[PDB]
Amino acid sequence: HDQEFDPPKVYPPVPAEKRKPIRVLSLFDGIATGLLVLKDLGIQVDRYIASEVCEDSITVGMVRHQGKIMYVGDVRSVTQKHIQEWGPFDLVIGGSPCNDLSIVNPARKGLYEGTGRLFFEFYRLLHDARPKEGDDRPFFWLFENVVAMGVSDKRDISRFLESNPVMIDAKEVSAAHRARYFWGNLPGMNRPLASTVNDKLELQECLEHGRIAKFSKVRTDQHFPVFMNEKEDILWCTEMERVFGFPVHYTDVSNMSRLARQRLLGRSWSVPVIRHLFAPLKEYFACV
Amino acid sequence: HDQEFDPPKVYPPVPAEKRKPIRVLSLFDGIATGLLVLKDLGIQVDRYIASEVCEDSITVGMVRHQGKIMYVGDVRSVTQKHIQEWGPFDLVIGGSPCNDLSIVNPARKGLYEGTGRLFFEFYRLLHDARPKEGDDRPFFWLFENVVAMGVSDKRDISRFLESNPVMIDAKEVSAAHRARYFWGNLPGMNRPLASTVNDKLELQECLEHGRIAKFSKVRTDQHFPVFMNEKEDILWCTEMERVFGFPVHYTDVSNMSRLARQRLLGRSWSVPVIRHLFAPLKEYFACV
Numbered sequence: 001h002d003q004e005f006d007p008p009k010v011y012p013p014v015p016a017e018k019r020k021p022i023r024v025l026s027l028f029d030g031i032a033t034g035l036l037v038l039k040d041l042g043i044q045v046d047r048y049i050a051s052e053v054c055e056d057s058i059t060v061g062m063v064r065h066q067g068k069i070m071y072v073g074d075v076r077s078v079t080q081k082h083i084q085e086w087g088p089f090d091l092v093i094g095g096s097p098c099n100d101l102s103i104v105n106p107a108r109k110g111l112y113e114g115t116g117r118l119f120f121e122f123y124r125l126l127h128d129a130r131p132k133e134g135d136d137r138p139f140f141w142l143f144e145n146v147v148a149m150g151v152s153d154k155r156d157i158s159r160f161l162e163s164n165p166v167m168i169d170a171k172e173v174s175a176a177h178r179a180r181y182f183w184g185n186l187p188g189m190n191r192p193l194a195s196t197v198n199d200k201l202e203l204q205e206c207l208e209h210g211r212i213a214k215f216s217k218v219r220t221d222q223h224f225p226v227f228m229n230e231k232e233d234i235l236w237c238t239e240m241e242r243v244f245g246f247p248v249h250y251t252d253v254s255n256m257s258r259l260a261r262q263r264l265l266g267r268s269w270s271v272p273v274i275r276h277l278f279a280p281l282k283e284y285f286a287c288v
Numbered sequence: 289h290d291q292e293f294d295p296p297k298v299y300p301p302v303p304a305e306k307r308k309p310i311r312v313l314s315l316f317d318g319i320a321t322g323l324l325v326l327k328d329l330g331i332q333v334d335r336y337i338a339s340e341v342c343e344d345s346i347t348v349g350m351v352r353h354q355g356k357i358m359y360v361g362d363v364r365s366v367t368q369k370h371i372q373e374w375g376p377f378d379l380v381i382g383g384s385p386c387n388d389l390s391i392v393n394p395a396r397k398g399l400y401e402g403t404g405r406l407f408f409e410f411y412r413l414l415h416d417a418r419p420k421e422g423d424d425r426p427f428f429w430l431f432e433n434v435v436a437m438g439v440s441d442k443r444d445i446s447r448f449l450e451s452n453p454v455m456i457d458a459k460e461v462s463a464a465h466r467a468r469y470f471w472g473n474l475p476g477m478n479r480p481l482a483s484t485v486n487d488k489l490e491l492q493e494c495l496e497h498g499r500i501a502k503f504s505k506v507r508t509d510q511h512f513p514v515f516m517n518e519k520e521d522i523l524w525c526t527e528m529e530r531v532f533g534f535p536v537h538y539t540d541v542s543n544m545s546r547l548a549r550q551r552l553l554g555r556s557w558s559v560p561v562i563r564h565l566f567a568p569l570k571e572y573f574a575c576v
């Protein structure tokens with residue numbers, strides 16, 4: 001599909017003597033997957049600012065990052081003054097809530113409802129955190145969304161962000177079936193999925209003991225995908241974290257139920273997919 | 289209180305050339321605290337047999353011990369034939385459910401109801417697993433119960449088990465307020481609480497980040513014992529595991545709610561108290 005045409009801006013590599021840690025703005029953070037991947041790659045983080053509403057996700061971040069995260073409330077409360085007073089950013093990330101962007105809803109409300117239009121909030125903060133002309137600072141940005149969108153919606157998003165959406169499927173690097181569009185200007189945006197041997201490709205490596213995988217991988221019949229003691233059992237939450245690439249026992253931070261952990265892990269990013277995406281940032285920024 | 293009088297049987301120490309791994313019968317296992325403590329002390333376990341009813345506790349054991357546990361169902365299904373066919377045991381452990389043994393109930397049903405009389409099931413399996421006369425094999429046993437019992441109940445239990453109940457309070461070695469009676473014939477049954485520096489004595493060492501302990505320790509006002517972001521918050525389950533001496537994120541094994549994790553962790557043993565109790569077994573049995 002060639003509807004628009006624009007070259008991706010490739011920044012020159014900075015040497016090690018002018019190497020600086022990253023300043024990261026994370027708009028729709030949720031479960032703090034971005035800072036988790038950044039800490040796993042061994043990258044020094046000078047400032048991480050997450051604008052999260054949901055208190056369970058804020059609790060996930062406060063437990064798993066120990067007060068490193070600077071919290072904002074709603075993204076509508078962020079102005080241009082808040083962007084220009086919190087220093088210039090080096091990495092902007094986010095994925096808008098796809099309640100009305102997904103075409104799996106028969107009665108979907110579209111891009112221009114209060115769940116979808118938050119994307120434009122992103123664009124506004126994309127417009128504020130972007131450096132002006134004449135500044136050769138390497139500025140990188142990343143937007144995530146689902147594959148189940150309309151043609152006009154994806155076309156308008158691609159025109160607004162001015163980048164080619166690469167499609168990445170979790171089955172090439174992890175044990176999940178979800179294809180996601182990624183807008184951004186990272187180097188090697190469409191390079192193939194370098195599967196890490198430490199990543200759990202099959203489903204059975206993500207299971208616990210005493211459980212047999214019925215399928216080869218899981219999706220995002222009135223049965224259950226795991227047999228347990230010759231009985232079909234629901235897929236566990238820690239096993240869901242191992243499928244989604246998270247560390248073991250990650251989203252157990254408060255007194256939330258099983259349904260809350262499902263709602264948090266469903267909306268979260270895939271750790272291996274991000275690790276692939278954030279990989280070339282290591283040569284552009286600080287290392288630890 | 290000197291109502292009965294009997295000397296504790298002290299077994300001779302076996303040297304290292306005749307040293308064998310342990311065979312453990314665990315009647316009212318629940319959360320597998322005994323085998324956890326045994327693996328933490330570095331003791332080779334040849335056979336561990338847990339007779340547990342509740343499927344959540346069986347799931348805890350299957351996750352945290354990887355099929356090492358031989359499961360029986362109800363303790364009433366165990367006969368003398370099952371004891372004599374599963375080899376002679378070296379350590380028998382258990383704590384009966386104190387639904388009717390506790391005097392915190394105003395309408396308590398007593399020792400001789402189906403929650404209390406399961407203790408006698410223990411005694412029956414204590415009678416079957418005990419070696420006959422002439423056998424100098426070191427056989428050890430341990431029964432646990434709450435402090436809130438009647439005088440006649442504790443007297444009858446002490447007469448039936450023929451041992452002096454030592455009282456151990458969790459506050460001397462951990463951050464919990466519970467005193468428990470321990471019947472048994474382990475060496476150093478009433479030696480004082482050797483507090484380990486690796487054990488978390490204070491409550492604040494068991495908390496996560498961003499939470500301030502209101503009290504010095506927790507119990508087993510319409511307020512909450514932990515402030516979180518200048519707001520009173522319920523004590524977390526993983527923090528409850530850190531209080532009770534369990535490893536971090538221990539009882540997160542299936543899709544159980546907060547109330548199920550409370551019901552499992554409440555009935556469970558205190559890991560440091562057991563570690564103290566199981567400590568002298570290291571010189572009588574195998575080491576790893």
Ligand SMILES: Nc1ncnc2c1ncn2[C@@H]1O[C@H](CSCC[C@H](N)C(=O)O)[C@@H](O)[C@H]1O
Nearest residue numbers: 028029030031053054075095097267268269
């Ligand atoms: N107006 C808003 N501003 C900021 N966050 C919002 C928001 N509305 C909802 N959220 C929260 O932000 C998250 C966006 S949903 C997708 C999250 C993202 N894919 C991830 O990496 O986890 C949701 O968890 C939702 O609870």
Ligand SMILES: Nc1ncnc2c1ncn2[C@@H]1O[C@H](CSCC[C@H](N)C(=O)O)[C@@H](O)[C@H]1O
Nearest residue numbers: 316317318319341342363383385555556557
């Ligand atoms: N008849 C029975 N036989 C075996 N287990 C039983 C039982 N009835 C109840 N149980 C279970 O056995 C446990 C006894 S309650 C106390 C458990 C013990 N203090 C511990 O170390 O965890 C409870 O979790 C209960 O679910």
